[PDB]
Every structure is written in C-alpha cells, then in structure tokens.
Amino acid sequence: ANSDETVGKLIAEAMDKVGKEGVITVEDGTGLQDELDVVEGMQFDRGYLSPYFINKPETGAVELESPFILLADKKISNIREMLPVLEAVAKAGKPLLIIAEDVEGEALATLVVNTMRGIVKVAAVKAPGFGDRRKAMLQDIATLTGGTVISEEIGMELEKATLEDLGQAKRVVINKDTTTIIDGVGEEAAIQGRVAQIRQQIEEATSDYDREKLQERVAKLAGGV
Amino acid sequence: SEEIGMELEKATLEDLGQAKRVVINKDTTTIIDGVGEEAAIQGRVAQIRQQIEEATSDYDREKLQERVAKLAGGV
Amino acid sequence: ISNIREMLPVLEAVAKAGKPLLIIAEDVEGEALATLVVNTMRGIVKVAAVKAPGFGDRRKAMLQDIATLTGGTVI
Amino acid sequence: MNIRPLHDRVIVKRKEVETKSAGGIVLTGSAAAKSTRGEVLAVGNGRILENGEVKPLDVKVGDIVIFNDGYGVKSEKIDNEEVLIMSESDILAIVEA
Amino acid sequence: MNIRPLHDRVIVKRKEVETKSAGGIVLTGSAAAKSTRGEVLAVGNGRILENGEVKPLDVKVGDIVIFNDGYGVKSEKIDNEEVLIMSESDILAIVEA
Amino acid sequence: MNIRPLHDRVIVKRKEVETKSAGGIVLTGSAAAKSTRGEVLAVGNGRILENGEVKPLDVKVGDIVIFNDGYGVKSEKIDNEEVLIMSESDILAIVEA
C-alpha cells in the first residue's frame, strides 16, 4: 500500500480474525477513516418477507430466541403444508424461522396474524442464492443447525415433516437486509466433514468462479467473513 | 389492512381515528389536532427519528424527516 | 425417459437380482429421475442416470457401440 | 317478518368463515374460502314430483347441516340478516352428536 | 361430533396416495396421482327416487370401497380429518377377501 | 383379495394390444391403438333403476366381451394386475363359437 502502515495493520488484523479459510473484501466506506467489520458465525444476504414481524422495534430487526429452523427447498404459497409442522412448534413453545425458496400469498399473510396474536413466533426469509447454488447453500444451513432439507424434488412433502427434521439455533437475528443464525446445534463432526468436503470441491474447481463462491461458503461454515 | 388478515366490514367505531377538525380542498387534506395518545406520538417519532439514522442513502433520509415534520413540528 | 412406469418391469428384475444398474437414455427427467433417487437413497435398488453420448443421428449410432461392448440390446 | 319456502326448498343460514382453530391451536387466517355448514330455519312442505302425493323433507326446522354450495343456492336478506335458499337436493348431511 | 348423511349420500375416508409398493419391491415415488380406495364411515337411509318407497344402500358402515373420484364427490373436515361425501352412484365396488 | 362390483357395474380384464396377425401373415406392428376385447371377472347383482325389482346382468362371470372403451370405464389395480370397471351399458357383444 505504498508504505501505508494502517492498511498493513488492518489486513493483518482481518487475516487474524476470519482465519485462514475466511474471506476479506474491500468496499467504499461511509466516512473519512478506514473501518474493519467482522461478521461472527453465519449470515446471508436476506431480509424478512414480513416486516410486520419485527419483535424489536429498536434495531428494526427480528430476534428469535432459541428457535426451530424450517428449511424448505420448494417455494411456499399455502398455509396448508405448514399446519402439521406449524402445530408441533406451537405446542412446543419455541419460535420458528422459515428459510424457503420464497414465502408469499395467504401463507405469508396468515403467518403474520399468527405472531401478531401470540399463537406462534415465526419468521420468513428468502433462500440464500439462486438456481443450483441455492439448494447447495440451503443444505449448508441444515448441517450447521442439525436439520433436514425438505426438498420437494427428492420425493418429500412439506406436510409430512415433523419436529425431527427441523434445525435449531441458540438465537437468530434478522433485519431488512440480512439474516444471521447465531450458534446452531450442528453435530461437530458433521460440520468439519461437510467443510472438508466443500474444501476439496475448491480443489477440483474447474475455473475461478466455482472457486470463489465455494471458499465463501466455507467461511460461513468455518471461520468468519 | 386487508394484508394482515383484516376485513373492512368487521371494523367498528373502535378502530376509527378522531380529530378536532378537518380541511380538504381539490389539492390537499389537512387534519387539525387529532386525538393522538401523546406518548404514542413522540414514541412513533423517536422510532422514525432513528430510521433516518440507519438510512442507507439520501432518499430514505429525505422522506423520513419529511414525515417526522408532519408528525412533530411544522412544514 | 420421463415416467417411472416403463421402468417397473425391468427395474424390478434388477432389484431381485442384487446387481446395480446404469441407465443411458436420451434423457431422464420428471418424477422418473426423482423417484430413482429415493430408490437408491433407501437401498431398494442401486441405479444411475446419465444422458446419451452425442446428438441427433450420431447418438443412436454411438449408443449401439455401448450395447456391443456390454452385450446389451438397444431398446 | 319471517319466510315460507315453497315446497322442496329449504331456508338456511351460514356459519363461520374458516373458524380460526383448524390444525389445532393455529389460528388459520382466512385463506380466501367459505363455510359449508349452516342452520335450517325453514322447511317447505316437500317435493311434489311425479304427481301422486307430496313427500316431506328429511330435514327439520333447526337442524345443523353440511350442504353443497353451488348454483342451486340463492342469497337473500331477511330483517337484514344473511340467509340461503337451496333445495334438499343440495343438503348432503346433518351434524349431530 | 360425527356426521349423518342425507339419504343416498355416503360418507367415506380416503386411503394411501400411491403406496410405495407397486411393481413389487420398487418404492414408486408419488407420480402426481391420488387413490380411489376408501373406508365407509356413514350411510344415508337410501335413495328416495320415484316416490313409492325408499330403497336402502348396498354399502354398510365400515366397508372398504373403490369409487370414482369425480364432480359428485365433496371434501369436508370433521374433528380435523379429511372426509369425502359422494352418492352410492359414485361407489363402484367393494374390496373384500 | 378379489373384487365385488356394485350392481350394474362389471369387472373385466383387457386383451392383446393389436395382436400381430391381422391382414394374414403380416405382423402388423403397434399402430398406436388398443383392444376392445376382454374377459369378464366379476358381475354386480344388476341395475336397480325404476325402483321396483332389481334386474340381473346378461353377462356371466368368465365371458369374452367386446366393449366400448369410453368415459364410463375405469382403470384399477388388483393384486398388481390391470383390470377395468364399466357398466353393462358399455358392453356391446359376446364373442362365442
């Protein structure tokens, strides 16, 4: 950096925090001074679909305490498929995050009135990514929270999922732009296994792009961003 | 809001707002002194006041402080 | 291929034979491909699906090559 | 004033549009659907068909009924209350017990 | 509470949507189809047609039946369970033996 | 287990899809057509229509029949074998001699 001690120090600092398999990106800052952000644990670029669900108006963000996590591969539109599962969670007390391909229609709508009343505490946020990348990434989340991806593709109905298939977390933070899972159950051995597998997916990455996204995901699942 | 599971038909006098007076012409509507729970006004103001704090641009800054003026001081 | 239907008679004979099965068709999609997954995902049968080598009139010529090398009949 | 249905026709009143209870505790918000249950308010003498005799209806005044809401059914206003006029042919069952 | 079908109408419950067994051992995953088999839960007195007398139905409470799932059939919710309302005309056979 | 058709309905099984013999020696390969011939496996008591009495069916268990394959006919699976359910109205003739 042409003898800029501050750049050196900031890089050094970043490298130290995100680890060896962590990503570091540079972008325009707001003010005059350089600034380093380190995102802890896993977080993807996803805002709540229902803004009328913010349970902390101070930050303008959703903060679900020790919740269940529903991973839906297919997009949701009907409250129907939820009822069997939505029910098991309601009679369990714990809140529920839902990361589907999408949530719209009267499904999204009714979910609002279900928390607006105090029947269940339930969040809805789009799936991270697009196309064949999404399902790959949605699985990452399953691993970190010990849940099963309900994939309509591989002969599975959303309706026939039980508490069994749900992921779990210590806490969840969702605002208008990003969702963050804080410390998921995550079978320790199954994390680093799914990491050492994606780690080798970069090894045989036949370009630069199928190299980038991969080591991004590893950072979300291993160190930091 | 028909969005959040509500029918217009099932609203009662309960849900209606109230004002001291209202002035409407061909271009503008004006509510003069609404009931407005004092504490709920400045609370809803201090909340929109912080929405400008985390306004990620200049436009989501403009309209916000416009609204605060309509709810707090004057224009 | 698109339907599991046409498979069942054959898929069955292989299932009760123990040996796995590769399928080289023109294509495999729909619920055919989908169900085949859950059939190996469980341990009912071990079955692979891969497109045919080539395109147009070259494909059938080449697909026959495979038949010869493995002693099979092109359906 | 009340109503007197004309033989074979039955006068009923509808019930709760997706009562928020189904699935258990979940308050299933209205999914853009209706209800098929209803209370029988009035009964006509009975179908006159086939000339010879006039057969009574198998639903009495005050029954709770599941019906098929199709074309046969009509909507009317009595004393400013929502009421339905369909024939027994459209009534499928009675909820008892 | 249970249901009382209105003469000629039969109240049944559906069975397993493409039970993974057909073809032998193969677990034929759902091909976007339904089932036509069902259990008879309630029976109406019987068809009243042609005035003179009221003929009983040939299906008893508790029969296993193959039906034709067409327009005649309707979907209802009793105690939060999926039930079907069709007339005997739509019931084709009984599975016994 | 076998099947018990519900009065008027007849349970049959289809025959050979364009048996390669027609025209004489020529093995007429499948031209995208079906067969109308079939074996009667089960019979219902008989049509009940017009109240008074219940008339038997003119086809016995085991007949060879030409039918009209239209809407009336339905497809079912018994012990994993292809069977057809139509009414006598759809059976046109019997092949004998």
mmCIF file with all atom_site columns, N, CA, C and O in Angstrom, chain A residues 85-110:
data_model
loop_
_atom_site.group_PDB
_atom_site.id
_atom_site.type_symbol
_atom_site.label_atom_id
_atom_site.label_alt_id
_atom_site.label_comp_id
_atom_site.label_asym_id
_atom_site.label_entity_id
_atom_site.label_seq_id
_atom_site.pdbx_PDB_ins_code
_atom_site.Cartn_x
_atom_site.Cartn_y
_atom_site.Cartn_z
_atom_site.occupancy
_atom_site.B_iso_or_equiv
_atom_site.pdbx_formal_charge
_atom_site.auth_seq_id
_atom_site.auth_comp_id
_atom_site.auth_asym_id
_atom_site.auth_atom_id
_atom_site.pdbx_PDB_model_num
ATOM 1   N N  . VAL A 1 85  ? -46.684 -29.160 10.844 1.00 0.00 ? 85  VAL A N  1
ATOM 2   C CA . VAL A 1 85  ? -45.419 -28.760 11.455 1.00 0.00 ? 85  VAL A CA 1
ATOM 3   C C  . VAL A 1 85  ? -45.611 -27.550 12.354 1.00 0.00 ? 85  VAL A C  1
ATOM 4   O O  . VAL A 1 85  ? -45.260 -27.581 13.532 1.00 0.00 ? 85  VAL A O  1
ATOM 5   N N  . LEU A 1 86  ? -46.161 -26.487 11.775 1.00 0.00 ? 86  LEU A N  1
ATOM 6   C CA . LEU A 1 86  ? -46.514 -25.275 12.499 1.00 0.00 ? 86  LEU A CA 1
ATOM 7   C C  . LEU A 1 86  ? -47.171 -25.612 13.826 1.00 0.00 ? 86  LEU A C  1
ATOM 8   O O  . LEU A 1 86  ? -46.956 -24.925 14.821 1.00 0.00 ? 86  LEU A O  1
ATOM 9   N N  . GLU A 1 87  ? -47.969 -26.676 13.827 1.00 0.00 ? 87  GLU A N  1
ATOM 10  C CA . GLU A 1 87  ? -48.648 -27.137 15.032 1.00 0.00 ? 87  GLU A CA 1
ATOM 11  C C  . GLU A 1 87  ? -47.689 -27.684 16.086 1.00 0.00 ? 87  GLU A C  1
ATOM 12  O O  . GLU A 1 87  ? -47.741 -27.269 17.246 1.00 0.00 ? 87  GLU A O  1
ATOM 13  N N  . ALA A 1 88  ? -46.826 -28.612 15.682 1.00 0.00 ? 88  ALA A N  1
ATOM 14  C CA . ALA A 1 88  ? -45.867 -29.231 16.596 1.00 0.00 ? 88  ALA A CA 1
ATOM 15  C C  . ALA A 1 88  ? -44.999 -28.189 17.312 1.00 0.00 ? 88  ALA A C  1
ATOM 16  O O  . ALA A 1 88  ? -44.678 -28.354 18.492 1.00 0.00 ? 88  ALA A O  1
ATOM 17  N N  . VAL A 1 89  ? -44.647 -27.120 16.593 1.00 0.00 ? 89  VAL A N  1
ATOM 18  C CA . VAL A 1 89  ? -43.867 -25.999 17.140 1.00 0.00 ? 89  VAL A CA 1
ATOM 19  C C  . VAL A 1 89  ? -44.697 -25.150 18.118 1.00 0.00 ? 89  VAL A C  1
ATOM 20  O O  . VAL A 1 89  ? -44.192 -24.720 19.158 1.00 0.00 ? 89  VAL A O  1
ATOM 21  N N  . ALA A 1 90  ? -45.967 -24.924 17.775 1.00 0.00 ? 90  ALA A N  1
ATOM 22  C CA . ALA A 1 90  ? -46.903 -24.163 18.612 1.00 0.00 ? 90  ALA A CA 1
ATOM 23  C C  . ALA A 1 90  ? -47.095 -24.776 19.998 1.00 0.00 ? 90  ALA A C  1
ATOM 24  O O  . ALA A 1 90  ? -47.192 -24.062 20.998 1.00 0.00 ? 90  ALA A O  1
ATOM 25  N N  . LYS A 1 91  ? -47.149 -26.103 20.038 1.00 0.00 ? 91  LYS A N  1
ATOM 26  C CA . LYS A 1 91  ? -47.322 -26.844 21.278 1.00 0.00 ? 91  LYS A CA 1
ATOM 27  C C  . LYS A 1 91  ? -45.980 -27.206 21.912 1.00 0.00 ? 91  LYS A C  1
ATOM 28  O O  . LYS A 1 91  ? -45.921 -27.996 22.851 1.00 0.00 ? 91  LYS A O  1
ATOM 29  N N  . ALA A 1 92  ? -44.907 -26.620 21.392 1.00 0.00 ? 92  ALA A N  1
ATOM 30  C CA . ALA A 1 92  ? -43.571 -26.826 21.935 1.00 0.00 ? 92  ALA A CA 1
ATOM 31  C C  . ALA A 1 92  ? -43.014 -25.557 22.587 1.00 0.00 ? 92  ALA A C  1
ATOM 32  O O  . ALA A 1 92  ? -42.059 -25.624 23.361 1.00 0.00 ? 92  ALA A O  1
ATOM 33  N N  . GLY A 1 93  ? -43.612 -24.408 22.272 1.00 0.00 ? 93  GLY A N  1
ATOM 34  C CA . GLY A 1 93  ? -43.233 -23.141 22.880 1.00 0.00 ? 93  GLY A CA 1
ATOM 35  C C  . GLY A 1 93  ? -42.174 -22.352 22.126 1.00 0.00 ? 93  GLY A C  1
ATOM 36  O O  . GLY A 1 93  ? -42.289 -21.134 21.982 1.00 0.00 ? 93  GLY A O  1
ATOM 37  N N  . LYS A 1 94  ? -41.142 -23.047 21.653 1.00 0.00 ? 94  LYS A N  1
ATOM 38  C CA . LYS A 1 94  ? -40.036 -22.429 20.922 1.00 0.00 ? 94  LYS A CA 1
ATOM 39  C C  . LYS A 1 94  ? -40.507 -21.749 19.632 1.00 0.00 ? 94  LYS A C  1
ATOM 40  O O  . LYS A 1 94  ? -41.426 -22.240 18.978 1.00 0.00 ? 94  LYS A O  1
ATOM 41  N N  . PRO A 1 95  ? -39.899 -20.615 19.281 1.00 0.00 ? 95  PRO A N  1
ATOM 42  C CA . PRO A 1 95  ? -40.161 -19.945 17.997 1.00 0.00 ? 95  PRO A CA 1
ATOM 43  C C  . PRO A 1 95  ? -39.645 -20.725 16.781 1.00 0.00 ? 95  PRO A C  1
ATOM 44  O O  . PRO A 1 95  ? -39.020 -21.775 16.943 1.00 0.00 ? 95  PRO A O  1
ATOM 45  N N  . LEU A 1 96  ? -39.906 -20.212 15.580 1.00 0.00 ? 96  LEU A N  1
ATOM 46  C CA . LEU A 1 96  ? -39.528 -20.902 14.344 1.00 0.00 ? 96  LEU A CA 1
ATOM 47  C C  . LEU A 1 96  ? -39.133 -19.949 13.210 1.00 0.00 ? 96  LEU A C  1
ATOM 48  O O  . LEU A 1 96  ? -39.888 -19.048 12.852 1.00 0.00 ? 96  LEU A O  1
ATOM 49  N N  . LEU A 1 97  ? -37.941 -20.158 12.657 1.00 0.00 ? 97  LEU A N  1
ATOM 50  C CA . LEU A 1 97  ? -37.522 -19.467 11.443 1.00 0.00 ? 97  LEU A CA 1
ATOM 51  C C  . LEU A 1 97  ? -37.846 -20.350 10.247 1.00 0.00 ? 97  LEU A C  1
ATOM 52  O O  . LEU A 1 97  ? -37.739 -21.578 10.326 1.00 0.00 ? 97  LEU A O  1
ATOM 53  N N  . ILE A 1 98  ? -38.263 -19.722 9.151  1.00 0.00 ? 98  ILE A N  1
ATOM 54  C CA . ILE A 1 98  ? -38.519 -20.442 7.907  1.00 0.00 ? 98  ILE A CA 1
ATOM 55  C C  . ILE A 1 98  ? -37.683 -19.866 6.759  1.00 0.00 ? 98  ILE A C  1
ATOM 56  O O  . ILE A 1 98  ? -37.871 -18.719 6.350  1.00 0.00 ? 98  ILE A O  1
ATOM 57  N N  . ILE A 1 99  ? -36.745 -20.667 6.261  1.00 0.00 ? 99  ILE A N  1
ATOM 58  C CA . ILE A 1 99  ? -35.965 -20.302 5.086  1.00 0.00 ? 99  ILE A CA 1
ATOM 59  C C  . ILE A 1 99  ? -36.392 -21.196 3.936  1.00 0.00 ? 99  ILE A C  1
ATOM 60  O O  . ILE A 1 99  ? -35.939 -22.335 3.795  1.00 0.00 ? 99  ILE A O  1
ATOM 61  N N  . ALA A 1 100 ? -37.307 -20.668 3.140  1.00 0.00 ? 100 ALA A N  1
ATOM 62  C CA . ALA A 1 100 ? -37.794 -21.354 1.960  1.00 0.00 ? 100 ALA A CA 1
ATOM 63  C C  . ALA A 1 100 ? -37.241 -20.656 0.725  1.00 0.00 ? 100 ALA A C  1
ATOM 64  O O  . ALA A 1 100 ? -36.532 -19.660 0.847  1.00 0.00 ? 100 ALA A O  1
ATOM 65  N N  . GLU A 1 101 ? -37.562 -21.191 -0.454 1.00 0.00 ? 101 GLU A N  1
ATOM 66  C CA . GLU A 1 101 ? -37.259 -20.545 -1.733 1.00 0.00 ? 101 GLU A CA 1
ATOM 67  C C  . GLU A 1 101 ? -37.979 -19.198 -1.833 1.00 0.00 ? 101 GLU A C  1
ATOM 68  O O  . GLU A 1 101 ? -37.446 -18.244 -2.404 1.00 0.00 ? 101 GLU A O  1
ATOM 69  N N  . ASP A 1 102 ? -39.189 -19.144 -1.275 1.00 0.00 ? 102 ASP A N  1
ATOM 70  C CA . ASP A 1 102 ? -39.975 -17.917 -1.144 1.00 0.00 ? 102 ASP A CA 1
ATOM 71  C C  . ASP A 1 102 ? -41.198 -18.168 -0.263 1.00 0.00 ? 102 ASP A C  1
ATOM 72  O O  . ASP A 1 102 ? -41.652 -19.305 -0.126 1.00 0.00 ? 102 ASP A O  1
ATOM 73  N N  . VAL A 1 103 ? -41.717 -17.101 0.340  1.00 0.00 ? 103 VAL A N  1
ATOM 74  C CA . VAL A 1 103 ? -42.982 -17.143 1.073  1.00 0.00 ? 103 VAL A CA 1
ATOM 75  C C  . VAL A 1 103 ? -43.843 -15.937 0.676  1.00 0.00 ? 103 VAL A C  1
ATOM 76  O O  . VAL A 1 103 ? -43.434 -14.783 0.838  1.00 0.00 ? 103 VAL A O  1
ATOM 77  N N  . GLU A 1 104 ? -45.030 -16.226 0.144  1.00 0.00 ? 104 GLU A N  1
ATOM 78  C CA . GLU A 1 104 ? -45.948 -15.207 -0.374 1.00 0.00 ? 104 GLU A CA 1
ATOM 79  C C  . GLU A 1 104 ? -47.402 -15.588 -0.073 1.00 0.00 ? 104 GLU A C  1
ATOM 80  O O  . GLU A 1 104 ? -47.664 -16.356 0.861  1.00 0.00 ? 104 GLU A O  1
ATOM 81  N N  . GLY A 1 105 ? -48.333 -15.039 -0.859 1.00 0.00 ? 105 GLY A N  1
ATOM 82  C CA . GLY A 1 105 ? -49.747 -15.385 -0.795 1.00 0.00 ? 105 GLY A CA 1
ATOM 83  C C  . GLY A 1 105 ? -50.385 -15.213 0.571  1.00 0.00 ? 105 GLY A C  1
ATOM 84  O O  . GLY A 1 105 ? -49.945 -14.381 1.369  1.00 0.00 ? 105 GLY A O  1
ATOM 85  N N  . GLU A 1 106 ? -51.425 -16.003 0.837  1.00 0.00 ? 106 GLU A N  1
ATOM 86  C CA . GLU A 1 106 ? -52.067 -16.010 2.153  1.00 0.00 ? 106 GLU A CA 1
ATOM 87  C C  . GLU A 1 106 ? -51.242 -16.779 3.202  1.00 0.00 ? 106 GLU A C  1
ATOM 88  O O  . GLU A 1 106 ? -51.480 -16.637 4.401  1.00 0.00 ? 106 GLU A O  1
ATOM 89  N N  . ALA A 1 107 ? -50.271 -17.573 2.746  1.00 0.00 ? 107 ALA A N  1
ATOM 90  C CA . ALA A 1 107 ? -49.336 -18.250 3.647  1.00 0.00 ? 107 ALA A CA 1
ATOM 91  C C  . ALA A 1 107 ? -48.574 -17.225 4.481  1.00 0.00 ? 107 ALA A C  1
ATOM 92  O O  . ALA A 1 107 ? -48.682 -17.209 5.708  1.00 0.00 ? 107 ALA A O  1
ATOM 93  N N  . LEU A 1 108 ? -47.823 -16.362 3.798  1.00 0.00 ? 108 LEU A N  1
ATOM 94  C CA . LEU A 1 108 ? -47.108 -15.263 4.434  1.00 0.00 ? 108 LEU A CA 1
ATOM 95  C C  . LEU A 1 108 ? -48.056 -14.425 5.292  1.00 0.00 ? 108 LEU A C  1
ATOM 96  O O  . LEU A 1 108 ? -47.762 -14.145 6.455  1.00 0.00 ? 108 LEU A O  1
ATOM 97  N N  . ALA A 1 109 ? -49.200 -14.064 4.712  1.00 0.00 ? 109 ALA A N  1
ATOM 98  C CA . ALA A 1 109 ? -50.201 -13.220 5.365  1.00 0.00 ? 109 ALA A CA 1
ATOM 99  C C  . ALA A 1 109 ? -50.692 -13.777 6.703  1.00 0.00 ? 109 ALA A C  1
ATOM 100 O O  . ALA A 1 109 ? -50.696 -13.065 7.705  1.00 0.00 ? 109 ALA A O  1
ATOM 101 N N  . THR A 1 110 ? -51.096 -15.045 6.715  1.00 0.00 ? 110 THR A N  1
ATOM 102 C CA . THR A 1 110 ? -51.635 -15.664 7.927  1.00 0.00 ? 110 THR A CA 1
ATOM 103 C C  . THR A 1 110 ? -50.568 -15.826 9.001  1.00 0.00 ? 110 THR A C  1
ATOM 104 O O  . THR A 1 110 ? -50.857 -15.678 10.188 1.00 0.00 ? 110 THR A O  1
#
